[PDB]
Amino acid sequence: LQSLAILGATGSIGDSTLAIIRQHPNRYRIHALTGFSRVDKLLALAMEFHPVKICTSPDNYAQLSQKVTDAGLDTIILSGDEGLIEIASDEAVDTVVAAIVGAAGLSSTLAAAGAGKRILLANKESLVMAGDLVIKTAKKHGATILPIDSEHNAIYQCLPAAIQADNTAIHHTSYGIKKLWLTASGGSFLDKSIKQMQNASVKEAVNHPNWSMGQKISIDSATMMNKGLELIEACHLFDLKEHQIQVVIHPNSVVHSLVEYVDGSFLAQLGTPDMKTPIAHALAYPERIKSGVMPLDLYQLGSLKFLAPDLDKFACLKLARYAARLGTGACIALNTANEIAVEAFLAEKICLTDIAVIVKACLDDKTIAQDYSQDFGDEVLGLERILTMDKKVRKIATAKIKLLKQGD
Amino acid sequence: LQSLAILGATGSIGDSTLAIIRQHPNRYRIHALTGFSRVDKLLALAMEFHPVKICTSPDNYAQLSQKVTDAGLDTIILSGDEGLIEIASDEAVDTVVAAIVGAAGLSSTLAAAGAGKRILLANKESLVMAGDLVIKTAKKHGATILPIDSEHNAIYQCLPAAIQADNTAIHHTSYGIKKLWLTASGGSFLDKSIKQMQNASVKEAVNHPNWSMGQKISIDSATMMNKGLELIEACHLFDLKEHQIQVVIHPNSVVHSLVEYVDGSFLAQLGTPDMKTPIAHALAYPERIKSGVMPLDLYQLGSLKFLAPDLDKFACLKLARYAARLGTGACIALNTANEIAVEAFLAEKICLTDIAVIVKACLDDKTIAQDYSQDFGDEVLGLERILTMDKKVRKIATAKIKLLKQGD
Numbered sequence A, B: 001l002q003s004l005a006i007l008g009a010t011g012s013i014g015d016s017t018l019a020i021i022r023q024h025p026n027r028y029r030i031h032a033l034t035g036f037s038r039v040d041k042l043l044a045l046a047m048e049f050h051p052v053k054i055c056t057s058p059d060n061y062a063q064l065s066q067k068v069t070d071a072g073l074d075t076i077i078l079s080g081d082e083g084l085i086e087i088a089s090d091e092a093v094d095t096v097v098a099a100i101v102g103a104a105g106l107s108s109t110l111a112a113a114g115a116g117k118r119i120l121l122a123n124k125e126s127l128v129m130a131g132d133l134v135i136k137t138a139k140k141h142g143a144t145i146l147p148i149d150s151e152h153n154a155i156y157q158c159l160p161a162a163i164q165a166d167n168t169a170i171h172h173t174s175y176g177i178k179k180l181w182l183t184a185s186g187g188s189f190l191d192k193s194i195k196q197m198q199n200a201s202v203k204e205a206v207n208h209p210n211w212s213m214g215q216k217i218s219i220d221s222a223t224m225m226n227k228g229l230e231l232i233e234a235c236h237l238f239d240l241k242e243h244q245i246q247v248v249i250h251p252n253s254v255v256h257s258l259v260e261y262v263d264g265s266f267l268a269q270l271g272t273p274d275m276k277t278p279i280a281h282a283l284a285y286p287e288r289i290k291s292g293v294m295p296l297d298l299y300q301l302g303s304l305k306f307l308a309p310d311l312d313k314f315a316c317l318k319l320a321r322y323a324a325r326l327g328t329g330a331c332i333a334l335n336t337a338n339e340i341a342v343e344a345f346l347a348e349k350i351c352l353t354d355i356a357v358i359v360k361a362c363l364d365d366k367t368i369a370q371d372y373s374q375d376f377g378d379e380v381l382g383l384e385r386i387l388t389m390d391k392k393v394r395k396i397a398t399a400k401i402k403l404l405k406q407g408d
């Protein structure tokens, strides 16, 4: 039985993954499950699946160990990055589902790559932060990356077999891949003024017309930073530069992305917007399996809309492409500044529209710019340099926010 | 150089094929080209490409041989089925593009199958008439069939590698194919009353909003018999029964068909409606090549509409599925009665809406029904039995038309 370790098991992507597993018992073994703050949920999950290991936050280590023994479970409890890395590199784990949010997922994804694991990547921030190093390390050590991100899974499904195996084949012109097309819902402020976007409450920003997701990706969807990060993710996943990857607004969230070929064929994946489809595809690959989604009814669709991105209004997407052109240092600055600004938005400290301001200022910061030319792709010193650069951006983005609330 | 024989070179599909060839001269050799009534066009094509053989109609044999020698060309002239069969089975021919319209294309397609050729099938009537025999014969003799028909080429592009090679693999549930979805423009009378459909002139029926095609497929598009024939073609091509193949109206002619998988993924081919895309894909397979189409601009699409087929209004599609369920005898009756009724419509003898009447009456005819149980799939006597049954249907459909213009 394919052995599974699920990182970020307590969150949104955690839920859909687990929902597939419950439809397919005796196909997968659950070896490990991780959470951070939701101890009780993690416990509940441990009692249900009886995993060999689980990992929680350092502040919940003791408490969770006590509850686990009180429940009479044989399960090992771990904590912090330490435990994630152990689980990600664990010898008895066949497949790792990387669904931790944000930079926090970086070390363990990198560890699964280092251990030659089959990796199901939801955690898009870890490739924005360290794409060169992640991919290099995977190839070096024989790890496989299947994308879980909906768009990237669509693109992956719509690419030839040879290129799924080896992303570099995309540059052989026989295959005739011309460009990739990323679809974006345009989030909940697509048909709203800039005025209403400033005034947005958190409830308005966090809720999405078509998708039910984690908090952060919800805010990113509203600002369109999500597509920005997806732009960089696609770059590393399919070994392209930003010029080969374009973006179309599509509010229905039915078409999930396209690959354009030289003969004029656009191969696309369509589906009801539900992460169980991409997750199910990646779990069973090369096979397929029922996912438990309510399949798309083509008779009841109506009009699928398409539209050019309004880049004044969704400057995050502008900035993301700008950063993609500058390389990894600027992609770290993009991502981390974004994490800090989103935290500030959710904490009712800035306006939704200030997220773009903060992120520009950090991209255009001289102190940050100085780091834009290091070897973040170095297999021995690269990690240390990404984590250091991350700390610096957190410091400056925070300062930037303080400054903005008065004047610069 | 891949050697090419083009059957139906003077027609619509002929034009697009040839237009690709002119963009790729150092890639294919033109070995043979065929036409029927357009002698001068065929001659013009012979002077341009200098083919080894050409074939025309029996009544133009002499005339065309005279003009060919007067032009100083070394090209052999052939005529009738005789010549088509010679060309289709010619030892120096690598690939055959079957783009003759109607049952007329049957013997030569069957001959290319019998000779183990790579075959690019536009000619959908020959598989409606003799699908069992064609496919059996191809597999027996090692012929390859790539679909040129737009919908089938879309479906083919959206299917896994293993199944492209071997259509039978589709029944292995690992691949998780659930059903196929055929898109239909709904022709030029989609948003018009039944009254206006009766009164339709030939000019109204023959012209199509999105496609420029031969006369017959144009009338079939207007009545939706085209999708009916496409339904049966898909059945034999991808080895399914009609229940696994469904139909959606899509007036924009951008999405050209879909394959639905068990996880909820719909893989689809999108493109501007232009047969150079499917033709180019089939010619270069497994590679790809520029086709000379103006590629789809996603920014300028607007609304892609989808809708259930109105089956009272497009009874041909009802009748086609009915025939598909009854098997080959009834598919011959469907197709041939359709040929005869379309000729009658174009000759200003029946109303557009009478095409469905005629075709039902022939499907429900006792004299025809008696033949619905023969072995039209027999490798030694099957052909004779299809051609005989064809002659009978032509006779009865004609009578049916005479009767209808007075009363039954």
Ligand SMILES: NC(=O)C1=CN([C@@H]2O[C@H](COP(=O)(O)OP(=O)(O)OC[C@H]3O[C@@H](n4cnc5c(N)ncnc54)[C@H](OP(=O)(O)O)[C@@H]3O)[C@@H](O)[C@H]2O)C=CC1
Pocket (backbone or CB within 6 Å): A007, A008, A009, A010, A011, A012, A013, A014, A034, A035, A036, A037, A038, A039, A098, A099, A100, A101, A102, A104, A122, A123, A124, A125, A148, A149, A150, A211, A212, A213, A214, A215, A216, A217, A275
């Ligand atoms: N539909 C979706 O939700 C989609 C999500 N993604 C991506 O998948 C990833 C997960 O997103 P999503 O599930 O929405 O987010 P959630 O906020 O719902 O889930 C986050 C998960 O990671 C854990 N986590 C949070 N902070 C830390 C930390 N500092 N250290 C270790 N673990 C932590 C959480 O634990 P706890 O909650 O127990 O504190 C939870 O298990 C993201 O990278 C997102 O961009 C991609 C496409 C679609």
Ligand SMILES: NC(=O)C1=CN([C@@H]2O[C@H](COP(=O)(O)OP(=O)(O)OC[C@H]3O[C@@H](n4cnc5c(N)ncnc54)[C@H](OP(=O)(O)O)[C@@H]3O)[C@@H](O)[C@H]2O)C=CC1
Pocket (backbone or CB within 6 Å): B007, B008, B009, B010, B011, B012, B013, B014, B034, B035, B036, B037, B038, B039, B099, B100, B101, B102, B104, B122, B123, B124, B125, B148, B149, B150, B211, B212, B213, B214, B215, B216, B217, B275
């Ligand atoms: N876009 C399109 O046009 C599409 C076409 N198809 C299919 O492709 C095939 C060709 O259609 P299309 O190109 O539109 O039709 P056309 O009417 O343009 O062309 C028909 C071709 O076959 C020849 N032909 C006609 N009658 C006979 C006969 N009795 N014996 C031998 N040859 C004959 C014609 O020669 P001549 O003209 O010199 O008489 C011509 O070369 C059809 O099977 C159609 O269903 C499928 C999808 C799209």
Ligand SMILES: O=CN(O)CCCP(=O)(O)O
Pocket (backbone or CB within 6 Å): A149, A150, A151, A183, A184, A185, A186, A187, A211, A217, A221, A222, A226, A227
């Ligand atoms: O993979 C799924 N998502 O990233 C959710 C997409 C929301 P968006 O279209 O507004 O980026």
Ligand SMILES: O=CN(O)CCCP(=O)(O)O
Pocket (backbone or CB within 6 Å): B149, B150, B151, B183, B184, B185, B186, B187, B211, B221, B222, B226, B227
């Ligand atoms: O392959 C191309 N065609 O069959 C032309 C399609 C016209 P329709 O959608 O009305 O059948």
Ligand SMILES: [Mg+2]
Pocket (backbone or CB within 6 Å): A149, A150, A151, A230
């Ligand atoms: Mg996504």
Ligand SMILES: [Mg+2]
Pocket (backbone or CB within 6 Å): B149, B150, B151, B152, B230
């Ligand atoms: Mg067609």
